[PDB]
Nucleic acid binder design. Structure first.
Ligand SMILES: [Mg+2]
Ligand SMILES: [Mg+2]
Ligand SMILES: [Mg+2]
Ligand SMILES: [Mg+2]
Ligand SMILES: [Mg+2]
Ligand SMILES: [Mg+2]
Ligand SMILES: [Mg+2]
Ligand SMILES: [Mg+2]
Ligand SMILES: [Mg+2]
Ligand SMILES: [Mg+2]
Ligand SMILES: [Mg+2]
Ligand SMILES: [Mg+2]
Ligand SMILES: [Mg+2]
Ligand SMILES: [Mg+2]
Ligand SMILES: [Mg+2]
Ligand SMILES: [Mg+2]
Ligand SMILES: [Mg+2]
Ligand SMILES: [Mg+2]
Ligand SMILES: [Mg+2]
Ligand SMILES: [Mg+2]
Ligand SMILES: [Mg+2]
Ligand SMILES: [Mg+2]
Ligand SMILES: [Mg+2]
Ligand SMILES: [Mg+2]
Ligand SMILES: [Mg+2]
Ligand SMILES: [Mg+2]
Ligand SMILES: [Mg+2]
Ligand SMILES: [Mg+2]
Ligand SMILES: [Mg+2]
Ligand SMILES: [Mg+2]
Ligand SMILES: [Mg+2]
Ligand SMILES: [Mg+2]
Ligand SMILES: [Mg+2]
Ligand SMILES: [Mg+2]
Ligand SMILES: [Mg+2]
Ligand SMILES: [Mg+2]
Ligand SMILES: [Mg+2]
Ligand SMILES: [Mg+2]
Lengths: 86, 205, 82, 80
RNA sequence: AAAUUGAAGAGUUUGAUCAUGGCUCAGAUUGAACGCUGGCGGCAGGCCUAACACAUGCAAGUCGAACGGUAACAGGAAGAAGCUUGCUUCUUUGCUGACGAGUGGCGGACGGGUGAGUAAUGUCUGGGAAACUGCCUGAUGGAGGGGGAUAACUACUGGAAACGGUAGCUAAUACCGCAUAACGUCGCAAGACCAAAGAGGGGGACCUUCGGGCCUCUUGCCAUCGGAUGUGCCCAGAUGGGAUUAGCUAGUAGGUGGGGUAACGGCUCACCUAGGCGACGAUCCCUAGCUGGUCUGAGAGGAUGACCAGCCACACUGGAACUGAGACACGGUCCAGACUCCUACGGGAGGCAGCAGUGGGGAAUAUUGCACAAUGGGCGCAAGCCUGAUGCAGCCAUGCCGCGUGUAUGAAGAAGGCCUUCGGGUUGUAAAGUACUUUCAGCGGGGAGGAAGGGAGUAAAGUUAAUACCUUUGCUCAUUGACGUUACCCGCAGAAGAAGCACCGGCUAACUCCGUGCCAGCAGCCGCGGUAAUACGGAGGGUGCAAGCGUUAAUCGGAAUUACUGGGCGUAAAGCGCACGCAGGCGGUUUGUUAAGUCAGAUGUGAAAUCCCCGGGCUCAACCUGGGAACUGCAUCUGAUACUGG
């Protein structure tokens, strides 16, 4: 970049990018564990997995990695499905 | 921006005295007043309808010392204004400062009056106005400023003025060299061998 | 945010300001929300020169609109005049 | 506050949808003659109670599909 | 009170006529150019072409009151000395006024440029419902206790440069757990789950580890529900042309369910139904940013979308996402392309449609200027710093408006020129002469306003333990203008420095002589030129404009010559060679009904500017400005039911 701060911003945005990426990848992992339990038909594994997932979709919302509404749908959606089976 | 050439030529072309000289002299002893300028002045113009309209507009312009652009703008304003356009045109002309200065007798001619104006010899309401086309309003007081008061042109100008018909709508104190534009002149105040409607016709076609 | 300020109209060497409420990001003479006064710094002061709809100015402040240094002055000046 | 349209059913083929035509007269902007104009609207018909040719009362609602932003309020006249 | 209360025709077909019909002219307008000419000023305008390519500077920073900090300069200091004993220079130490580089915060999504793309994820009008929203704002509570890092820096090392490699090492409002957790999110509920950060100013007992504790106020941080502003989304109507384009469509149209977004949605995927669009113009092709408005017109229209303002789109070309409240980012990142620059040959760097400026193209469009003083934006508690936004200045008669280039007197009316029947006429009161004025330009002298604030003190209130600090409001003192030699006023010198351009056969205001001889040439249209040419060219005279005047280009007008208002088709251009007939248009007469068309009223909206009316301010005018009227339109509701429609 040409301007002093523009240079600095590219550096900061890359750091943030690697920070966000790391936390975001983690989060989706814990979401995916729940969908995987559901697809195997286990209430407990899927409830257990939902309980681990809950606090982290909530936290990443508070931290701006995602919006509150996204966290809610995930909880709403998974909760809907797990109940529909056991 | 001003017509600077010979003046009696203009009178001679329009067929009338345009008061472009002081009036100290019978105009016929200064020029062949009843003959147009030039080699073919004796010739008569078998004059078209457009021609009579043109010459009448020229006549009025040459009386007041106004060139085409400003005069056309005067027509536009007369038209926009309420009431008869032809009469509105003459109100606007007759309200010019160079003109009013002439009518109070401060200048022997409108040309001389205009020079008085331009050369910062005239005040309006004790305020210096030096642009000729300044529109003067009812109750205004135009005066020769103190320093210009001893100019001999002005005394002579007031003498001649005293020998012209005296305009109704102006109150002039010759001693103070101040005067008051009481009201806009009516149509009836102004010469009756001006054909404004011809000028109005020229500018509507 | 929303701000109350002077949009400079008038002509060269003869400034004339229109007091306006607007999104602070829009250009000075650009998009505004509401016109609320004017300010002539060149007024003869024989008659008027500064007029403010103080009722609508306050309404906008009540909803968090900020106020120019220059409008903040006008308001104190006009409040003093009457 | 119940803004509404009235029109007739030109197609009832789709599952839970219908095509409604709203026809009106309009003054021609230049030549003054009054001209027929038609507006076709994809409308929601949950329960498919609307038959072709029916005259139906419809209202505007949120998007229901790429092309549906209207739903059925009620049938007015049917089976001419 | 006023505020669309306005409308012209001429030349040219014929021997002549009337009609038909085109061509042409008078008018307004312009971001103009060229030719001749050119004094001043105010206000405006200024690459219309190559969305061609760009050297150089500048156009986005700021905060030490988040943080470790010193390298510059500035003081200060135990202690070195300049020592001529209070003046001091340097060795030192961030002690502090500050501050390079660094982490961190907020801004680089605004401001500014362009109109390529787009006939619709556009614009305009009017409505909807499923949403987010930094800074600013109201409400109610948090702001507990910890942890591991890292740039800077240090050591070693690679590069020509750009910029790196190792290992050390350290701070925070950087970053992460843990606790706390509802008027928040999920859930029928029971329950389950989510955050944070400090930093400053001043201080009374009181005292220590002299850091501060503690007291106090300012400010920032977290949560939730609001306000305001911004933005996303959906529907309807309108918004160019072409049928020498008639059929178009597989995420296509809908349904179910999963996923997805801030949010509704074929947004996406699977499955199912077989739809959806189209002659009321789909599809395809050509062209184009839309609007307020602008120009023209009596109007209805026609033409148009510089300058100002609103929306959109773009940022070398094609594609992409990252950061962020906001971007798929105008001076950010990545990939590919086109192109250019640097190189020590191994490798690097960049994107003026920001402001100046350059090459190129063109009939044609400006200075590589001054200033943040004013308004406004970014950061900061502030002081302030930044701001080619902006305010100004330069250039160009490009346009509009104003003024000047003198005023008065001046006759047998000179000389010269021009015409003349040689009598005289004209140029012409024109010139010379005579007085007289001095705007503007020149030169000296003086001198408003655009300035509000901010800075020291002071005093009072609200604060508080407090007269501190903070903040508000009065007081005094000293101060802040790029423009600038400002506007404007006074003085000096002298008419002194300031007039050109086109036209004069008819249309069309203005006529004669000489030269030429169907030549040389003119020409908007008719038409001029072979011996008297007011038409060519010169002259004298005249007409029209005037710091301009002509020519060319260009829109509308006149053109009732695309005719809705407002025309025609026997012989002038125009009835299909004839009939049947789908779609379409139109449809006799009565009643009832409906209330879409139509009509009425009410309400909201129709941005500001512009236009118009009455006022106000610059000496006037252009110009600036207050208020109004107007926006003839759209939409919702409620009525009326004669006519049209059902
Ligand atoms: Mg779902
Ligand atoms: Mg002029
Ligand atoms: Mg003939
Ligand atoms: Mg020249
Ligand atoms: Mg200028
Ligand atoms: Mg340019
Ligand atoms: Mg620094
Ligand atoms: Mg933090
Ligand atoms: Mg917790
Ligand atoms: Mg903590
Ligand atoms: Mg779905
Ligand atoms: Mg285009
Ligand atoms: Mg511009
Ligand atoms: Mg420009
Ligand atoms: Mg614009
Ligand atoms: Mg791109
Ligand atoms: Mg994001
Ligand atoms: Mg954009
Ligand atoms: Mg650039
Ligand atoms: Mg060239
Ligand atoms: Mg003679
Ligand atoms: Mg001068
Ligand atoms: Mg001042
Ligand atoms: Mg004639
Ligand atoms: Mg000629
Ligand atoms: Mg001859
Ligand atoms: Mg033309
Ligand atoms: Mg017409
Ligand atoms: Mg006809
Ligand atoms: Mg016959
Ligand atoms: Mg025929
Ligand atoms: Mg026939
Ligand atoms: Mg009834
Ligand atoms: Mg005035
Ligand atoms: Mg106005
Ligand atoms: Mg108004
Ligand atoms: Mg308006
Ligand atoms: Mg009926």
């Amino acid at each position: 970049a040409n301007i002093k701060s523009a240079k600095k911003r590219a550096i900061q945005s890359e750091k943030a990018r690697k920070h966000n990426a790391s936390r975001r990848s983690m989060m989706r992992t814990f979401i995916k564990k729940v969908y995987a339990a559901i697809e195997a038909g286990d209430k407990a594994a899927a409830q257990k997995a939902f309980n681990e997932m809950q606090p982290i979709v909530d936290r990443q919302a508070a931290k701006g990695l995602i919006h509150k509404n996204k966290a809610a749908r995930h909880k709403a959606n998974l909760t809907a499905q797990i109940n529909k089976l056991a | 921006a001003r017509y600077l050439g010979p003046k009696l030529k203009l009178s001679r072309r329009e067929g009338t005295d345009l008061f472009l000289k002081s009036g100290v002299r019978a105009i016929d002893t200064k020029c062949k007043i009843e003959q147009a300028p030039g080699q073919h002045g004796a010739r008569k113009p078998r004059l078209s309808d457009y021609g009579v309209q043109l010459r009448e507009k020229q006549k009025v312009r040459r009386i007041y010392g106004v060139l085409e652009r400003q005069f056309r703008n005067y027509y536009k304003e007369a038209a926009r204004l309420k009431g008869n356009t032809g009469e509105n045109l003459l109100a606007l002309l007759e309200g010019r400062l160079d003109n009013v200065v002439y009518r109070m007798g401060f200048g022997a001619t409108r040309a001389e009056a205009r020079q008085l104006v331009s050369h910062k010899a005239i005040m309006v309401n004790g305020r210096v106005v030096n642009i000729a086309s300044y529109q003067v309003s009812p109750n205004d007081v135009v005066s020769i400023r103190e320093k210009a008061k001893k100019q001999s042109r002005v005394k002579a100008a007031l003498e001649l003025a005293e020998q012209r018909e005296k305009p109704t709508w102006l109150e002039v104190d010759a001693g103070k060299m101040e005067g008051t534009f009481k009201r806009k002149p009516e149509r009836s105040d102004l010469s009756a061998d001006i054909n404004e409607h011809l000028i109005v016709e020229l500018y509507s076609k | 945010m929303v701000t109350i300020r002077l949009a400079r109209h008038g002509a060269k060497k003869r400034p004339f300001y229109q007091v306006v409420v607007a999104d602070s990001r829009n250009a000075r003479n650009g998009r505004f929300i509401e016109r609320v006064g004017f300010f002539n710094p060149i007024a003869s002061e024989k008659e008027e020169g500064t007029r403010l709809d103080l009722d609508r100015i306050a309404h906008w402040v009540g909803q968090g609109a900020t106020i120019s240094d220059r409008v903040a002055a006008l308001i104190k000046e006009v409040n003093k005049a009457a | 506050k119940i803004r509404t349209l009235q029109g007739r059913v030109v197609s009832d083929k789709m599952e839970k949808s219908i095509v409604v035509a709203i026809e009106r007269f309009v003054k021609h902007p230049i030549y003054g003659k009054f001209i027929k104009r038609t507006t076709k609207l994809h409308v929601h018909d949950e329960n498919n109670e609307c038959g072709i040719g029916d005259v139906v009362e419809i209202r505007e609602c949120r998007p229901l599909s790429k092309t549906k932003s209207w739903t059925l309020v009620r049938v007015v006249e049917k089976a001419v």
